[PDB]
Design a protein around this ligand. Structure first.
Ligand SMILES: [Mg+2]
Ligand SMILES: [Mg+2]
Ligand SMILES: [Mg+2]
Ligand SMILES: [Mg+2]
Ligand SMILES: [Mg+2]
Ligand SMILES: [Mg+2]
Ligand SMILES: [Mg+2]
Ligand SMILES: [Mg+2]
Ligand SMILES: [Mg+2]
Ligand SMILES: [Mg+2]
Ligand SMILES: [Mg+2]
Ligand SMILES: [Mg+2]
Ligand SMILES: [Mg+2]
Ligand SMILES: [Mg+2]
Ligand SMILES: [Mg+2]
Ligand SMILES: [Zn+2]
Lengths: 105, 86, 122, 50, 119, 203
RNA sequence: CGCGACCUCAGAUCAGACGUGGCGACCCGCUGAAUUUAAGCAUAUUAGUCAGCGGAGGAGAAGAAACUAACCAGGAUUCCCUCAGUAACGGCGAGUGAACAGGGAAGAGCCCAGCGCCGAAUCCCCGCCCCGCGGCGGGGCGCGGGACAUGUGGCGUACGGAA
């Protein structure tokens, strides 16, 4: 029974949520595991960059952002054709290649 | 006469000892168990009786094959090798 | 008095059967002495005789199974007791060559475009 | 019932061999915490509803 | 020049081969774990059993439960080289089998009891 | 090649030749048992497009599934409770009958592995499907690197877990704005991520 | 009054293999209520929930767009935060309720059928020689068998491909 000027609240606790509580006590150990896997990968690829292949210049869609520049999924095939690098050689070199990206500009 | 005179004329049995679970559940008329379901090929278990599950999980009996499976796992599943003799 | 294993590794099979029969005679006599009472010096030897029977039968089973696997070693279909038993799925795995079988297209990919070794910022 | 089967007679034979008291040399052991058997079955109390 | 004599069509008896296996399923045959020594455990030193031996020309033995009367007969004849008139078996309420081995009257029971050790 | 001619020939099902062929094959397949091994594909172009390579080890079955919806397995009336669920006649089973045919084929042969299946005919009372089955243990499949993913134990009973093309369509999975379920692993995983509470360490 | 081929279907204690069942905490495909709430209750809610059935794996599933967007356009899937208790659904009542974009963890790409070109150039089993043979593999010797033109193998798959 709501009384004397509170918010008209709608709590979503009508299901069996206590069986499905996801406690997050794993997460500092998970940060340790991700750190160990990242260091093992960096020791695996010994002269190569630890982050990975080169990511392209990519501008955000959805006119909210519209000015930020991101890292992309990969360089497009027209970009590889103008740069003079074959699409099956660029992956061996360490250049990100995806065949899905258009190039309208 | 539904009490003591009805307990008096109890002679013949309905359930006997089964031969897969060994409990007194093998019904002589239906030829079924109802504790494991012997004429069925699958073991009778249900999730509404977790107590009856943990009466016979895999950690109950002798585990006479599964414990040496665990030991051969921690050893490495090697076969036919002998240690170096004296 | 002790029947060990090193002295049984090199004996003939009929002599092993004769020693086994002598141990069975001594085992039956010690059971008769156990039932008639006898003494504790006769009650204590039945364990030694049973373990000696176990050792003789163990050495016989060793020699016959190494002879059978020396016989079937080389054939393509060997018996199920001689086949290796690790686990069910591990016996139902691949052939250690079938996992390494690659197609001609994948070999052509790995041959024409191998993963190169590189470094940056120089 | 004098018309037993082999399984029932084998089960009852094992019950007879289990209905047996603890020998006196048990109690002189080192880590003993056993006083009596606590499974002494009598033929009137537990009736073996087989 | 072939007519259906019967109106029914029964399946024709086709040729089938026998088991000529390429490899045996087991490497060795199973050894006899029901030997003459392992089938006879011990005789009884009961006073009733000794009266049975002294009076009725028998020998009382305690036998494994998986045995036949023919197996007990050939077992006694193999172990102690004595002929058997008959073998008479019961099962005690302890799991073991009890064998009254009636001997042939040409051989004595008290003498062979002295040979096997009981008195 | 001839496979494109056979492809549009099996497309034009309403013409008189293909109606005669579907009538004769529907009669011939109805007069057989419910599940039987076919020695060669009746529709080889569709079998090849779904993955049948005519070599040793690829088996096909032909199977009859009854036609219609699903009646609720209850007694006489007797759906006890609120009047939402009392209808037992006009309710539909959420998984397709072609996947039911794959399911019954894999249940009859759990030793074989279901690849895919297709349609060979229908009656008013039955449908007729052809299910491609693969040996896990035959050497022509086991030594072929293109199709040795099937021999791996991860793909056991695709007909049961809904991993074939007939059972995958009943799962409602796909990319885009029209599904929005199975946007994790499946409907169960989407429900789980949307109805587990993430109570952190520091909140 | 028969023989020989093909096609469909049998019988084998035929030679060689596979599956049955258990556990089931996590996962997948189904099936699936009622307590409860709505101060009653009937849609709704509890709830794709409990129970029930099958199936595996060390993870499973999903997954490289018949996508999102309407922008100077992004670009497999999965998972965390935010979007957001929002758009929306609801006797519009109780209550239910995502997604895009953005910041991260990780990041990996591909193969077929068809279209066609190569003398089936392809694959399975048995006999013999050589290697270790305890997850039966490689080379050769066989007008030795079989599968296969009702299509095996190589090139080749939407990023185009072939001569
Ligand atoms: Mg990163
Ligand atoms: Mg009483
Ligand atoms: Mg309702
Ligand atoms: Mg998949
Ligand atoms: Mg659909
Ligand atoms: Mg199973
Ligand atoms: Mg209420
Ligand atoms: Mg109330
Ligand atoms: Mg459940
Ligand atoms: Mg997977
Ligand atoms: Mg797709
Ligand atoms: Mg997305
Ligand atoms: Mg809902
Ligand atoms: Mg082709
Ligand atoms: Mg190819
Ligand atoms: Zn039972």
């Amino acid at each position: 029974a709501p009384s004397r000027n509170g918010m008209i609240l709608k709590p979503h606790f009508h299901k069996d949520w206590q069986r499905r509580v996801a406690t997050w006590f794993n997460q500092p150990a998970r940060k340790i595991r991700r750190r160990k896997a990242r260091q093992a990968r960096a020791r695996r690829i010994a002269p190569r960059p630890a982050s990975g292949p080169l990511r392209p210049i990519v501008r955000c869609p959805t006119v909210r952002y519209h000015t930020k520049v991101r890292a992309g999924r990969g360089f497009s095939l027209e970009e590889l054709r103008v740069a003079g690098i074959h699409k099956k050689v660029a992956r061996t070199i360490g250049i990100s290649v995806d065949p899905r990206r258009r190039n309208k500009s | 006469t539904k009490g003591t005179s009805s307990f008096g004329k109890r002679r013949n049995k309905t359930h006997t000892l089964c031969r897969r679970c060994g409990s007194k559940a093998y019904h002589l008329q239906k030829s079924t168990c109802g504790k494991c379901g012997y004429p069925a090929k699958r073991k009778r278990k249900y999730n509404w009786s977790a107590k009856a599950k943990r009466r016979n999980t895999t950690g109950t009996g002798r585990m006479r094959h599964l414990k040496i499976v665990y030991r051969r796992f921690r050893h490495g599943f090697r076969e036919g090798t002998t240690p170096k003799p004296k | 008095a002790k029947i060990k294993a090193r002295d049984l590794r090199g004996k003939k099979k009929e002599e092993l059967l004769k020693q086994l029969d002598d141990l069975k005679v001594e085992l039956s006599q010690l059971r008769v002495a156990k039932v008639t009472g006898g003494a504790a010096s006769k009650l204590s030897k039945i364990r030694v005789v049973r373990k000696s029977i176990a050792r003789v039968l163990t050495v016989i089973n060793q020699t016959q199974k190494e002879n059978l696997r020396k016989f079937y070693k080389g054939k393509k279909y060997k018996p199920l007791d001689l086949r290796p038993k690790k686990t069910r799925a591990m016996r139902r795995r691949l052939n250690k060559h079938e996992e390494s079988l690659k197609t001609k297209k994948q070999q052509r990919k790995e041959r024409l475009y191998p993963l190169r070794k590189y470094a940056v910022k120089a | 019932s004098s018309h037993k089967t082999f399984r029932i007679k084998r089960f009852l034979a094992k019950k007879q061999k289990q209905n047996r008291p603890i020998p006196q040399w048990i109690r002189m052991k080192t880590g003993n915490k056993i006083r009596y058997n606590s499974k002494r079955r009598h033929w009137r109390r537990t009736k073996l509803g087989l | 020049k072939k007519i259906r004599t019967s109106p029914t069509f029964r399946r024709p008896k086709t040729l089938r081969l026998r088991r000529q296996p390429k490899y045996p399923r087991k490497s060795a045959p199973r050894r006899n774990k029901l030997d003459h020594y392992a089938i006879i455990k011990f005789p009884l030193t009961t006073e009733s059993a000794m009266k049975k031996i002294e009076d009725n020309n028998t020998l009382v033995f305690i036998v494994d439960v998986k045995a036949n009367k023919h197996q007990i007969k050939q077992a006694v004849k193999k172990l102690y080289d004595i002929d058997v008139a008959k073998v008479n078996t019961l099962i005690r309420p302890d799991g073991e089998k009890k064998a009254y081995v009636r001997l042939a009257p040409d051989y004595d029971a008290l003498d062979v009891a002295n040979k096997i050790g009981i008195i | 090649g001839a496979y494109k001619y056979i492809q549009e020939l099996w497309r034009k099902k309403q013409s008189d030749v293909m109606r005669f062929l579907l009538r004769v094959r529907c009669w011939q397949y109805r007069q057989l048992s419910a599940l039987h091994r076919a020695p060669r594909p009746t529709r080889p172009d569709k079998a090849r497009r779904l993955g049948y390579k005519a070599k040793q080890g690829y088996v096909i079955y032909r199977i009859r599934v009854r036609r219609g919806g699903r009646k609720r397995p209850v007694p006489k009336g007797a759906t006890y409770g609120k009047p939402v669920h009392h209808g037992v006649n006009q309710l539909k089973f959420a998984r397709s009958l072609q996947s039911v045919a794959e399911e019954r084929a894999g249940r009859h042969c759990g030793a074989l592995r279901v690849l895919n299946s297709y349609w060979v005919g229908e009656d008013s009372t039955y449908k007729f499907f052809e299910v491609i089955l693969i040996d896990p243990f035959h050497k022509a499949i086991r030594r072929n690197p293109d199709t040795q993913w099937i021999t791996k134990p991860v793909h056991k009973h695709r007909e049961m877990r809904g991993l074939t093309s007939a059972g995958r369509k009943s799962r409602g999975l796909g990319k885009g704005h029209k599904f929005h379920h199975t946007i994790g692993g499946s409907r169960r995983a989407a429900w789980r991520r949307r109805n587990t509470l993430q109570l952190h360490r520091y909140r």
